């Protein structure tokens, strides 16, 4: 795998800031958030060209080991061989993923945990900085 962080104790309203390097030969990368590897309130998966998808962001949840229903976004502000920063927060309703250039995606909060304690990176994404503000 890639970087795995636990015991984050990120509460609602708090911001998780992630900066990483997207491989020049990136097919996709993954940002997983939740309670643990089996309970993800956000599976954040920009696909450059992978699993039959091209320039498409695929989000999903994982509940008790069971993948939820995939959600897709039209816009794709990610370029291979580049640094990508992501700010994540959540409330009772949605997880919000903000990019600095103003892009903002919502994913419905399907798990309703009191905190994000788990973060995992995977695929063609190497994390350089992680911040909690």
Ligand X SMILES: CO[C@@H]1O[C@H](COS(=O)(=O)O)[C@@H](O[C@@H]2O[C@H](CO)[C@H](O)[C@H](O)[C@H]2O)[C@H](O)[C@H]1NC(C)=O
Stretch that binds a second copy, among 2-10, 34-42, 51-59, 100-108 (CB under 8 A): 2-10
Q: Does the protein bind ligand X through residue 67 (CB under 6 A)?
A: yes
Establish if 32 lies at the interface with ligand X (CB under 6 A).
Answer: no
* Residue choice 9, 12, 36, 70 for contact with ligand X (CB under 6 A): 70
Residue 87 found at the interface with a second copy (CB under 8 A): no
Choose which of 8, 23, 87, 99 interacts with a second copy (CB under 8 A). Answer: 8
In this complex, which beta carbon is closest to a second copy, that of residue 50 or of residue 130?
130
In the block, residue with structure tokens 């063609």: 124
Which positions from 112 to 131 touch a second copy by CB under 8 A, shown as an x/- string? Answer: ---------------xxxxx
48 annotated as a binding-site residue? no
Which residues are CB-neighbours of 82 under 8 A, at least 6 positions away? Answer: 21, 22
Please give, one letter per residue, the 3-state secondary structure of the chain. Answer: CCCEEEEEEECCCCCEEEEEEECCCCCEEEEEEEEECCEEEEEEEEEEEECCEEEEEEEEEEECCEECCCEEECCCCCCCCEEEEEEEEECCCEEEEECCCCCEEEEECCCCCCCEEEEEEEECEEEEEEEEC
Query: Given the rule CB under 8 A, which residues bind a second copy?
Result: 1-8, 127-133
Binding residues for a beta-D-galactoside: 43-47, 51, 60, 67-70
């Amino acid at each position: 795998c890639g970087l795995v962080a636990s015991n984050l104790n990120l509460k609602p309203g708090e911001c998780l800031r992630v900066r990483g390097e997207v491989a020049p030969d990136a097919k996709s990368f993954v940002l997983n958030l939740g309670k643990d590897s089996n309970n993800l309130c956000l599976h954040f998966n920009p696909r450059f060209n992978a699993h039959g998808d091209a320039n498409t962001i695929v989000c999903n949840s994982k509940d008790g080991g069971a993948w939820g229903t995939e959600q897709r976004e039209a816009v794709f502000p990610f370029q291979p061989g580049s640094v990508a920063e992501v700010c994540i927060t959540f409330d009772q309703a949605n997880l919000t993923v903000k990019l600095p250039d103003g892009y903002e995606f919502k994913f419905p909060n399907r798990l309703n945990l009191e905190a994000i304690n788990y973060m995992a990176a995977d695929g063609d994404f190497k994390i350089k900085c992680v911040a909690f503000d």
